[PDB]
Design a protein around this ligand. Structure first.
Ligand SMILES: Nc1ncnc2c1ncn2[C@@H]1O[C@H](COP(=O)(O)OP(=O)(O)O)[C@@H](O)[C@H]1O
Length: 301
């Protein structure tokens, strides 16, 4: 995890998020008070986990990691709550997936810091979700700080790439870093994994630095096109084009045809497809745009 930022000063991008978090985080440290609960929302790979760890580290408290789909019985949640020390961070990934059982108990420990009277040390709840709207109304109004992360710019991603390459002790030319950033689908996690693969090409071809040639060879091997779309991205668009005539097609129907969970489609793949203008959502369902037809070389109906 030597590539993960350890402080906000090492976190490139998300300027609005950082200025908001920094304000409340520094104020709380200065007062020796427990930070207000924070909600981190946005597509995966954008640094929500990273920020959660940064928060605990800045407050100099312990972070307790867990996720909604794991805490089934109240006992599971109860144990974690009691292990919390004053000022500790309770980080819950996919918090919108907490079953009513543990959700009620969590909400309870937040209203007065005491579960059914049997006592909980004041703590900071930091939840993570792809869509803040997926959270229940009750728990939603519990976070005093809501941070919405959107995709990064190509410039920010390029900077993240150069930073990663330097840490892996490998030289890379600006134009090459730009090329990778343009194909990272607005996501730091994607950009870093791509940089590692390009690093492997640099190793096999025995080059002194990553250039455009090395990047293009890597992308052909990985099957990533000039827009950064991978095999499944294209499969989604092609399926809508061929099986559904460009759409509109419902989320459930599309998911069934692709053999994947609707969630993985709407929370993981569609976000960027919508942002990049390849897909659009209508009341009747998802539809492909003219840009997708042309990018994939299909005659525009
Ligand atoms: N702003 C950033 N600068 C550098 N690396 C980042 C940034 N945001 C995310 N990453 C990197 O990407 C990977 C993914 O991040 P993570 O925090 O797990 O995403 P999320 O929880 O939103 O899915 C991490 O390896 C991390 O170190």
């Amino acid at each position: 995890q030597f590539l993960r930022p350890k402080s906000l000063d090492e976190f490139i991008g998300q300027e609005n998020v950082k200025k908001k978090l920094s304000l409340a985080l520094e104020a709380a440290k200065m007062r020796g008070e427990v930070l207000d609960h924070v909600l981190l929302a946005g597509p995966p790979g954008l640094g929500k986990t990273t920020l959660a760890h940064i928060i605990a580290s800045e407050l100099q408290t312990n972070i307790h990691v867990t996720s909604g789909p794991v805490l089934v019985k109240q006992g599971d949640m109860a144990a974690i709550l009691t292990s919390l020390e004053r000022g500790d961070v309770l980080f819950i990934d996919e918090i919108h997936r907490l079953n009513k059982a543990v959700e009620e108990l969590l909400y309870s420990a937040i209203e007065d810091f005491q579960i059914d009277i049997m006592d909980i040390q004041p703590f900071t709840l930091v939840g993570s979700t792809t869509r803040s709207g997926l959270l229940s109304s009750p728990l939603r109004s519990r976070f005093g700080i809501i941070l919405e992360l959107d995709f990064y710019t190509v410039k920010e991603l390029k900077e993240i790439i150069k930073r990663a390459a330097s840490l892996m002790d490998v030289e890379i030319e600006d134009a090459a870093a730009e090329m990778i950033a343009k194909r990272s689908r607005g996501t730091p996690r994607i950009a870093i994994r791509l940089t590692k693969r390009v690093r492997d090409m640099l190793t096999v071809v025995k080059a002194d630095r990553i250039n455009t040639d090395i990047v293009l060879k890597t992308m052909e091997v990985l099957n990533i096109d000039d827009e950064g779309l991978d095999e499944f991205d294209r499969k989604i668009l092609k399926t809508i084009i061929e099986i559904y005539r460009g759409g509109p097609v419902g989320l459930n129907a599309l998911a069934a045809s692709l053999g994947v969970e609707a969630d993985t489609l709407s929370e993981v793949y569609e976000p960027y497809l919508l942002q990049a203008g390849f897909l659009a959502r209508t009341p009747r369902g998802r539809i492909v745009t003219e840009k997708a037809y042309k990018h994939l070389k299909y005659e525009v109906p």
